[PDB]
Amino acid sequence: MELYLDTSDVVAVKALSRIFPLAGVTTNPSIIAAGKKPLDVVLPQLHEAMGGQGRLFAQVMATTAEGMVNDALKLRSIIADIVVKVPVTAEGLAAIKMLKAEGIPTLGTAVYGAAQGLLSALAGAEYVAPYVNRIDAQGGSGIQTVTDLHQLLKMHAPQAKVLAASFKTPRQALDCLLAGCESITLPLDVAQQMISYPAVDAAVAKFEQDWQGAFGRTSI
Amino acid sequence: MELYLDTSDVVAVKALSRIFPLAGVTTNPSIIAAGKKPLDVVLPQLHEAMGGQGRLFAQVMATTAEGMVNDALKLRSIIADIVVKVPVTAEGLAAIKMLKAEGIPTLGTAVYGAAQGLLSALAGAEYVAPYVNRIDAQGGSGIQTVTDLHQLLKMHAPQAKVLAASFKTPRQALDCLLAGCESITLPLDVAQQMISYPAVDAAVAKFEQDWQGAFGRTSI
Amino acid sequence: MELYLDTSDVVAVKALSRIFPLAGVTTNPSIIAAGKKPLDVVLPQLHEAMGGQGRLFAQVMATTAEGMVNDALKLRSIIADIVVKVPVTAEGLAAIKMLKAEGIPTLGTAVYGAAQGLLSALAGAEYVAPYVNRIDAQGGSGIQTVTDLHQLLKMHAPQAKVLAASFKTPRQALDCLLAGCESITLPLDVAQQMISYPAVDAAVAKFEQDWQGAFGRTSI
Amino acid sequence: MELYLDTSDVVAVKALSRIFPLAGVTTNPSIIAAGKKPLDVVLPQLHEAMGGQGRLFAQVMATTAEGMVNDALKLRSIIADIVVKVPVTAEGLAAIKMLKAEGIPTLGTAVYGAAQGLLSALAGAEYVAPYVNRIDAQGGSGIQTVTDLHQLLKMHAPQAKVLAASFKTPRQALDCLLAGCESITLPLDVAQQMISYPAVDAAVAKFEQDWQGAFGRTSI
Amino acid sequence: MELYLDTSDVVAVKALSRIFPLAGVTTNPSIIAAGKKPLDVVLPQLHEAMGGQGRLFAQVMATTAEGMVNDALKLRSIIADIVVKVPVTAEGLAAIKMLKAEGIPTLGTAVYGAAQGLLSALAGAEYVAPYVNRIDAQGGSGIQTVTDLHQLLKMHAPQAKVLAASFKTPRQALDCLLAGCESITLPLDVAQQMISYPAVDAAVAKFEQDWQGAFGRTSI
Amino acid sequence: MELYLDTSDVVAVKALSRIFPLAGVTTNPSIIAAGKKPLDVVLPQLHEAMGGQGRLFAQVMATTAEGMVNDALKLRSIIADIVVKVPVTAEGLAAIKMLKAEGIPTLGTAVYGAAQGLLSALAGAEYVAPYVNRIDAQGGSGIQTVTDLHQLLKMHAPQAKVLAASFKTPRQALDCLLAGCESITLPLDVAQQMISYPAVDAAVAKFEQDWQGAFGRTSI
Amino acid sequence: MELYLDTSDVVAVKALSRIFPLAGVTTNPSIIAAGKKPLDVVLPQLHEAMGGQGRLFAQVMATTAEGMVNDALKLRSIIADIVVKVPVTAEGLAAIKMLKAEGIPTLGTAVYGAAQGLLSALAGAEYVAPYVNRIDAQGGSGIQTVTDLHQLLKMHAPQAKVLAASFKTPRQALDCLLAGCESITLPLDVAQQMISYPAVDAAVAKFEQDWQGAFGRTSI
Amino acid sequence: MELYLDTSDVVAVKALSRIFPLAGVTTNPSIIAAGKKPLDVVLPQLHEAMGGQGRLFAQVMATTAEGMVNDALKLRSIIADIVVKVPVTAEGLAAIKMLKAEGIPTLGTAVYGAAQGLLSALAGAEYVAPYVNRIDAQGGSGIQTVTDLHQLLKMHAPQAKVLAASFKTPRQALDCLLAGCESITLPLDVAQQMISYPAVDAAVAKFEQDWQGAFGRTSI
Amino acid sequence: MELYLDTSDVVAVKALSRIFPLAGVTTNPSIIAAGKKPLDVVLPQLHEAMGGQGRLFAQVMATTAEGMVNDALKLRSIIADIVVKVPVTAEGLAAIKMLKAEGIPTLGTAVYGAAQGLLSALAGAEYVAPYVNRIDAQGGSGIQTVTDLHQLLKMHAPQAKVLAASFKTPRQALDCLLAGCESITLPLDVAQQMISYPAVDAAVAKFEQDWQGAFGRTSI
């Protein structure tokens, strides 16, 4: 299982590095725009924030196959081992094919259809990233869509993996993991809601209270 | 399958040693408080009660990652091979991470969510212990939660194992075992209700009665 | 839906009368033994405990048909409208039949089989009381048994109603209610865990904290 | 729901009359042969054994339509309101047509097929009696067949009712009742195992044990 | 529940009239050709073989809407109340429309699609007749096809009824009846297979045998 | 059940009027563009091809609420009783509420979400029209979406009805009808493939061939 | 089905009044605190934004039963017909009971358990408001919990209704409606996401494009 | 698969040895009482009835661990390779454990709970024998219990095997085998009901009848 | 998968040898009687129509184990490698055990019970042959029974295989194959209906019609 964060704030990334066993951080130009900082700064700083380990992900903006080819060349020049994710269109499939020919790992993003993601995987993307929240909000069923995509990948192209993103509530992440996703990423607020429970807090408080009422200190 | 006792009564565990194939005894500071005796006394006596065999478990109470690190150092000093369980918070995950770094086996306790247990397992905890009775009491469904946690473990983290606790009726234990739990623990009252059945007693009485009416004795 | 309490402590009954919309209180000779007080005292005081309202239930102890006949006569002499529960044996069936002939409402207790309860209902018992916790403890399935009993009653004897008892966790009561039970009774501890949730407490605390930080009062 | 007994022993019928709310007793020439006594003698005897109330059933033995017509005439001469059951063949359907024309109630026995029983019911039979134990013993599924027959009767001929027979264990009766059967009959051994439970006995025993431990007496 | 026969032999019809509660006899030009005799002869003879009561069905052979209009006029001239079935084409739907305009009951035959039968029913045909055996032989599934047809008729046009035909084994008839068919028809041999069971024969034989062994006589 | 056509060809409408029991014809501006003829001509001609009966539907083209109000006034001026279709946007809901205040029946089109259709139905649309084929083509599930919409309407807004459109194969229409749709519309090609089957043709051919081989003629 | 809004902005409420058929607006002290304006000022403004129609909801704040009694008195004094929501505790239960005694309609809020909401409904609350998003975030399952609550209400207390709240994604609202909720409330952003779809926008755009290509305008 | 017999009649065992591929015979002291013959006689004669092969099973009668120790010693002295069955109590588990220490194979009998049988298997008994008929008659579900026991064994203790006993009808044996039981034992009458079918007999009869019709004789 | 033919017409076997990949032909004395010719004449001719390959099957007629042993000896003397089929009785089981001791492969025929077939397979028959059509004709469920038989074989006796026979429609063969049968045999009529479809014929007709309309020839 691979755990990533969809954010670009260096301080939060470094702070949460000590908590979860991070496998890397994925970023999108929307989050980059939110952070306001230029990429040639954000990737180095975030890389140092995660201790120089893990994986990295960045997204191109071009519309023509050679255009996102050149964009991926720039990204690989900046960070040697980054994976370049590309929106899935006809040009997206093309860029995937020549990028796989060049041997640079690629990710399929903006996936709204199981057939679309399967086509991207056949073209050669090692990762496929459906937009769970957007698909769910647009009248679809992101959970079932992820299920079908996972089944198709496992039963035709084993080497491909599913990377779930676009989360708003912990439940969506729970169902995505239950569907067999090999990798997921989550935003900071959902991550915080993963590691806080009033029931857990009350249980710990009662636990310490009993220890205190018994032995007259708190420490072991 | 690993069977443990959720209690701290030396005489009780010694008496029940000849009945069930005990794999160890798990203790929590609440039960230790009920037993009123200090840990440095109860652990050696219990270890002798299992004849120097079986597994052992104790829990920290600190809030800071270094705090449960020091506590776990104390437990490993008292008992070399004892497994230390930690309440699952952000600090719990941190402590689990450096504990897996230093190579001390750990257990995840006070687990109320499948995602929480999955996070603990990814951090590296060897066992995950949800509170089935507490979850069911607080409007949740402990059985389905345990099933989901087991599925997530078998899917992403094969090396982790589920250790069910917090039982009030034999039905909960049976359901947890049917869910695929690799290890469970139970209290003395549930253990007693496990091995007693009026139907079994009546069948044995009728059986001996048949032998009596046949041969003039109940013997041989 | 009919809500009752299976206990005999006057103070607790009176205190909880202000909270739940009580329909009555059921008692059994085991609970009477626990309370240590004679019935001719406990029933009047309890009747005043919910102020002369609700329903009352008490159980016979004789084995012979005329035995619980005289018993039920004594209970009706003490409280005019009390409903008498009888254990379901052959003598129980005979007693239920001829008490239904006399026109005194009766209840079927100590029910361990759905067909047993159905036979009691055919004999004429107004209520049937399975022992869910004991059935689960003895390797059965109380929830499914209650389900079959409810289906059989709604199919053949519409006038009979299921009165669930013998609870240890609120989950059992939840499943019994979901099965279609028209009446349930529960003990004090399950009632207390029923109306308390740390999540609710934290939510209301944060709620009033926000309103306090906004305007500085504790009420409208 | 209609409860009957498939037996011919006057003493047992009278003894069990005080236990269950009997609706009558069904008889067949097999159990008549086992009882050894002639029908014209036994029939008034158990008729009085049920207190003179309830239903009665007896079977023909002829092979030709007019033959079992004459048999039914003899039975109606012996007792006015008895229901005549006939084995289901081509002659059975013809005899049932004649008997329905004469307005004498009839029952369909020896039913091994759902379609066969449905045809018998459409011919005018008020009752249909499959042989659950025999069908199960011959590699079929008595419970399934009863279910299909019940559904067919309900959704085509509402006036027909299913009368299950041929039982060896109480489970078969339980599933027949769960399938929606409006009437069942059972043998004496199944009745005795039906109304006896060691668990119930032990519960009652513990009950007056604690009553005695409280009040110096097992009595109220 | 309407029981019909799909045959054209006067002797067989009259013989089976006494056994099954016939609602009528359906005929098709194929079976009429097999019977070799002309319609103007056969229909009076079958109508008398009924005992004078029941329903009669015959089919047109024309292609043009007015053509089967004239055909249906001829059938109504021969037998006043006969119901005319028409093959379902575009011309079939047209013919059904003018026949519903003129108030002559009609039946939809040669139905291979549930939507086709729905269209016929909406056009106004009183009955719809799918060909179960042919549909099954041609790679379809007549059972589920009839199921969907029945569901559609019930939930859109309540007045239409399903009349299943084309049977080869009793199982097909059983599933058609279980699917909710209000009427079916049945060939002679498969009908014979409804009314013969070796198990029933052996049961009757043993029954008479034990009666004889007990009473030294065969008679009741 | 309401049967409609989604086309604007007068000749085809008139020709198919003799076959199916038409309840009306729905038109959309795309189909009007395909037909190339102006609306003030197409609606009168279609109405005359109707025989003067049935229902009519037309769709407005403005964006602002009073805009489609005025357009609906124009259409209702051309044909007195036409139902106005409106796209479901915020302005669509506004216009629907205004028209419901004016008491003119309205049509909800371009429904890609069950919640959107429910909102239109609450606003007052008499019918809701999802685009099954487009929802399918965009990675959704048109059949399941129609199912949820039908359930929601039957649950909360009994007066609303589902009008399925956008079909490419008769299978989609079959599933839509099975889901409980009270009205559907079909294109000409799907209608033609609907009422044609080679199996039916071959069955009719064999049928008249046998009639010929019997009587020297294929005629009655 | 009753549609409400959970917000406190007068401008947004009035703007959305023309779009959805609003049944009222619910407010909670958290949102009131966010608005920072006193309730006696805010709710007249909302009432006018309704056009003087619809329902209103406000929550009590004190702790003692008489405390929320006086609070509800104040709310009824300020707005005559306003419904009062109360957090569900023991005090909340008592408040609900005697408020039903003097006939003040009440709503059950802060519900985290189906049995808790069922108890509130038994106490007499007209509406029950579970917190779907919070329950899902805390390891539960809000959808299934709402399902059980709805089933229990329809089974035991028909007059009670479920009012879903706490939404973050359209799917939660869709599933709550599918579960049978009679009323829901909706935050502004999620409501906006109910009425915007890129698919619908593109369909409308192409629609005007073809009208343009046909008649030289997108108009008329 | 292992087939055994639960009986003690030498003649029947020898006679059935030629028919079924016997793997052994299990005996219980009740059956020994029925046979009235002493064990030191029945086991040698039964072994000779085997022809000198197969497995043998006998049960202890003592209540104290050393008591069944001595009993098992006597049985192993009598027949070297006999497997000892022990009733499952606390002393039962203690005995099972120490004979697993001594390397003598053991069987768990009188099993009424899946958890009980699983505990016996963990203690080490090679076989577990639930009482299907008794459990089923006492209001339980023998088939489901056997299924759960088999699932638990295959999940946690692969080496343990389920040995079903206590049968009354062939259906119970069929379901037990379908549940995955690796070994079953069945009584003489039920085994006879496995090897007789009237349908099979009629088929054989008709078969020789057609051979006779062909060749004037029933033989090849 | 093994494909066989249940017939004895040499001309038909020879003709169909070119079409299907025959694995052999099974014969029974019923179809032998139908062919009227003696076995010693027919079976060499069928072996020659085979092309000298495939498998052969024939049945005994004796009722005694030794008699059908002699029958099998005669068959093996005539044809070196023919497999002998024996009816499954007690004598059949004995004959199978002895024949397996002689190393001659055997088939169990006239199988009406899954337990019966499983017993034969344990006795040593290489194949098991149920009679699907007779079973479903006699009120059973041939498809389900074949399913259970296949499950039991794959569970306990891996070497046994299912050989389905007795077919009337291709649907039954389809379900038998779907159940996992490793071998099936079908009659000539079902084979002819199997490989013929009017839909296929019409598709081919349209196909070469289009080829002709394109290139002025139907040729390639």
Curated annotation (Swiss-Prot), chains A, B, C, D, E, F, G, H, I:
UniProt lineage: Bacteria, Pseudomonadati, Pseudomonadota, Gammaproteobacteria, Enterobacterales
Pfam families: TAL_FSA (PF00923)
Family classification: Belongs to the transaldolase family. Type 3A subfamily.
Active site annotation, chain numbering: 85 (schiff-base intermediate with substrate)
Temperature dependence as stated in the record: Displays a broad temperature optimum and is active in the range from 20 to 75 degrees Celsius. Although no significant loss of activity is detected after 600 hours of incubation at 45 degrees Celsius (at pH 8.0), the respective half-lives of the enzyme are 200 hours at 55 degrees Celsius, 30 hours at 65 degrees Celsius, and 16 hours at 75 degrees Celsius.
Superkingdom of origin organism: Bacteria
Reported pH dependence: Optimum pH is about 8.5. Active from pH 6 to 12.
GO cellular component: cytoplasm
Biological process per Gene Ontology, one example term: ketone catabolic process
Gene that this polypeptide is encoded by: fsaA
Regulation of this protein's activity per its record: Inhibited by glycerol, inorganic phosphate and arabinose 5-phosphate.
Keyword Lyase found: yes
Gene3D superfamilies, sorted: Aldolase class I (3.20.20.70)
Reaction(s) catalysed (UniProt annotation): beta-D-fructose 6-phosphate = dihydroxyacetone + D-glyceraldehyde 3-phosphate
Quaternary structure and interacting proteins, as annotated: Homodecamer. Five subunits are arranged as a pentamer, and two ring-like pentamers pack like a donut to form the decamer.
The UniProt record lists the keyword Cytoplasm: yes
Additional comment: Is not inhibited by EDTA which points to a metal-independent mode of action.
Protein name: Fructose-6-phosphate aldolase 1
PANTHER family: FRUCTOSE-6-PHOSPHATE ALDOLASE 1-RELATED, TRANSALDOLASE
Entry keyword set: Carbohydrate metabolism, Cytoplasm, Lyase, Schiff base
Primary location class: cytoplasm
Technological use: Is an interesting tool in chemoenzymatic synthesis for the construction of chiral complex polyhydroxylated sugar-type structures. The use of hydroxyacetone (acetol) as a donor compound allows access to various 1-deoxysugars. Can also be used for the synthesis of a broad range of iminocyclitols, that are potent glycosidase and glycosyltransferase inhibitors, from dihydroxyacetone, hydroxyacetone or 1-hydroxy-butan-2-one as donor substrate, and a range of acceptor substrates.
E.C. designation(s): 4.1.2.-
Molecular function terms from GO: fructose 6-phosphate aldolase activity; identical protein binding
Broadest EC class assigned to this enzyme: lyase
Coiled coil: none
